[PDB]
Amino acid sequence: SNAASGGRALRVLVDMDGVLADFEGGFLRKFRARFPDQPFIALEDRRGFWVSEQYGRLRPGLSEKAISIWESKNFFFELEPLPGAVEAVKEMASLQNTDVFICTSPIKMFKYCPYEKYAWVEKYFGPDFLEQIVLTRDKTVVSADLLIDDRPDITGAEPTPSWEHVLFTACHNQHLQLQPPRRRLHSWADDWKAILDSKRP
Amino acid sequence: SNAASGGRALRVLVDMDGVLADFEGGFLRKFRARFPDQPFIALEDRRGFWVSEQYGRLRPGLSEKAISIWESKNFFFELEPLPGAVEAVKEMASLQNTDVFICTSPIKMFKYCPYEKYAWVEKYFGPDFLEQIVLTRDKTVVSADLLIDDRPDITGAEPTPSWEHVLFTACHNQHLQLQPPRRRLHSWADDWKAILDSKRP
Ligand SMILES: Cc1cn([C@H]2C[C@H]3O[C@](c4ccc(I)cc4)(P(=O)(O)O)OC[C@H]3O2)c(=O)[nH]c1=O
Ligand SMILES: Cc1cn([C@H]2C[C@H]3O[C@](c4ccc(I)cc4)(P(=O)(O)O)OC[C@H]3O2)c(=O)[nH]c1=O
Ligand SMILES: [Mg+2]
Ligand SMILES: [Mg+2]
């Protein structure tokens, strides 16, 4: 909830794909369904952030097939929420002196993706939560105290972002050793409130 | 253009509606076309930021008719660029040590608007410029040196935004007296480079 007028609430940016919405599991399900005769990558075997790069190493042409999954209508809209994500963000947004924004990057093909990201937020958090969405390719220009995001290295135009990046565990980053003092949130079952409280005055 | 790796480019947020895209003129044209039997507000007579509030004072029910214009498919997409806007932003983006983002707020009804804002940017600035778009209801959480925006009072979750707000003149704000030392850009013919240079070290 917002701080009193003029006051300064803790500000938390919560990523969408891989944090709120199960991009990797959705991707694999639809890839298997659409391309049953191709090899796939089990979630346990995912390595590197970019799904299509691993698929391309698997077999010539599989990268383009992978891309066609997320370019398709209803791919973003039909992603399942991660366990605990909706409940946690609803709780988080209800906390005193706490402003939560959902901060997400749309893909390059923009016909469906931005629209469906709005629709997905509406479906799970309600119409009033649409006020909290920020779409950007560059999260470094968004100022906050915390950014909870599955992408290990987040860089952009601002060489010194204001947020602390808390790495949200995902199949593709779960084996990564991080530079101290970088922190992880394992899942939404993990103690996200402690992380927030550690940033409060 | 981006600063050298690690370096810090001047960062300019450029608003879309009323700065790049002629929302007010588009609105009036389509309102007149759709509702030829209703009274309208000449651009010279626009007062207050919110178009629908003035229309509602004009006649009971006109507010809802006004809203239906911008909720319609192709309203955002078919807006004409303001004179000089495309040329200026292209020049601006080519300047050394200068990062330009188009920062826009989508309307509440999200079926068309975000999509069409991406499409409009693609149409006028090209596909690579899509990397520069930030969609947000709250521009105070976007960090930059400058925000060129027609809306007179821009507030939100960050009580002390990092940008200087330069008011871009529009039919609805052209008579407003501003608090010193607040600055205006009259139009894209006006000397926007001087404004930028005044923020450079
Ligand atoms: C968010 C995300 C996206 N992707 C896919 C989606 C598509 O997203 C992108 C992408 C998405 C956002 C950014 I910033 C940069 C690149 P595309 O360039 O827009 O198509 O990168 C190539 C593709 O990789 C992934 O494989 N894993 C992810 O976690
Ligand atoms: C950008 C802009 C929007 N509007 C119209 C558009 C629609 O935009 C909104 C609007 C848009 C952005 C914000 I932040 C807050 C409100 P809507 O609540 O999304 O429908 O406000 C009511 C309407 O007013 C205007 O009348 N003038 C403007 O310059
Ligand atoms: Mg992510
Ligand atoms: Mg505007």
Q: Ligand 4 centroid vs B19 CA: distance in angstroms?
A: 6
**Is residue B198 a part of any domain in this protein?**
yes
State whether A120 and A49 are in the same domain. no
CA dist., res. B148 & res. B151, Å (int): 9
For residues A53 and A179, what is the distance between their CA atoms, to the nearest angstrom? 24
Q: How far apart are CA B129 and CA B137, in angstroms?
A: 21
Whether residues B111 and B159 share a domain: the answer is yes
Query: In Å, what is the CA distance from A36 to each residue of A24, A33, B68?
Result: 17, 6, 46
Structure tokens at A109: 């093909």
Q: Map residue B80 onto helix, strand or coil.
A: coil
Return d(Cα A83, Cα A85) in angstroms, integer: 6
**What backbone phi and psi angles, to 5 degrees, belong to B67?**
-55, -40
Q: Report the 10 Å Cβ neighbour count for B75.
A: 19
| Euclidean distance between CA atoms A186 and A73, whole angstroms | 30
Question: Which residues are near ligand 1 (CB < 6 Å)?
Answer: A 17-18, 23, 49-52, 70, 105, 107-108, 137
Residues B116 and B87 in one domain: yes
- Say which DSSP state B86 is in: H
Structure tokens at A84: 């605990």
Q: Given the DSSP bridges, would you call strands A133-136 and B133-136 parallel, antiparallel or unpaired?
A: antiparallel
What was the experiment behind these coordinates?
X-ray
**CATH code for the domain in which residue B71 is found:** 1.10.40.40
Q: Which domain holds residue A32?
A: 23-77
d(CA A158, CA A140): 5
Residue B100 in domain: yes
Paired residues of A137 in beta bridges: none
CB B99 within 8 A of CB B10: yes
DSSP B170-200: -TTTTT----TT--EE-STTS-HHHHHHTT-
User: Exposed, middle or buried: residue B45 (CB in 10 Å: 0-12, 13-18, 19+)?
Assistant: exposed
- The position carrying tokens 């588009």 is B26
Q: Which residue has the least CA distance to atom 14 on ligand 1?
A: A137
Q: Using a CB-CB distance cutoff of 8 angstroms, which residues of chain B are in contact with residue A111?
A: 115
CATH code of residue A181: 3.40.50.1000
Residue B48 region by backbone torsions, left for phi larger than 0, else alpha for psi between -120 and 50, else beta:
left
- B147 is written with which tokens? 């925000």
Beta-carbon separation of B143 and A141 below 8 A: yes
Q: Whose CA is nearest to atom 28 of ligand 2?
A: B50
Q: What are the structure tokens assigned to A107, written together?
A: 């893909």
Write the secondary structure of chain A as one string of H (helix), E (strand) and C (coil): CCCCCCCCCEEEEEECECCCECHHHHHHHHHHHHCCCCCCCCHHHCCCCCHHHHHHHHCCCHHHHHHHHHCCCCCCCCCCECCCHHHHHHHHHHCCCEEEEEEECCCCCCCCHHHHHHHHHHHHHCHHHHHHEEEECCHHHECCCEEEECCCCCCCCCCCCCCEEEEECCCCCCCCCCCCCCCEECCCCCCHHHHHHCCCC
Our answer to whether residue A15 is catalytic in this structure is yes
Residues B147 and B183 reside in one and the same domain? yes
Residue B1 lies in a domain: no
**Rounded Cα gap, residues A106 and A5, in angstroms:** 32
Say how many domains are in chain B: 2
Tokens of B135: 């969609």
A48 to A56, A139, A172, A185, B113: CA distances (angstroms): 12, 20, 6, 18, 34
Residue B3 lies in a domain: no
Residues sharing a CB contact under 8 Å with residue B133, sequence separation 6 or more, in sequence order = A135, A136, A137, B101, B102, B104, B117, B118, B121
Q: Are residues B60 and B153 in the same domain?
A: no
- CB B144 to CB A142 under 8 A? no
Asked, as a colleague might, if the bond just before B180 is cis with ω within 30 of 0, I would say no
Judgement on whether residues B118 and B139 belong to the same structural domain of the protein: yes
A123 and A70 in a common domain: no
Name the residue facing B159 among A8, A127, A142 (closest C-beta): A8
Residues A49 and A29 in one domain: yes
Min Cα–Cα distance to chain B from A120, Å: 11
Q: Are B127 and A112 in contact (CB under 8 A)?
A: no
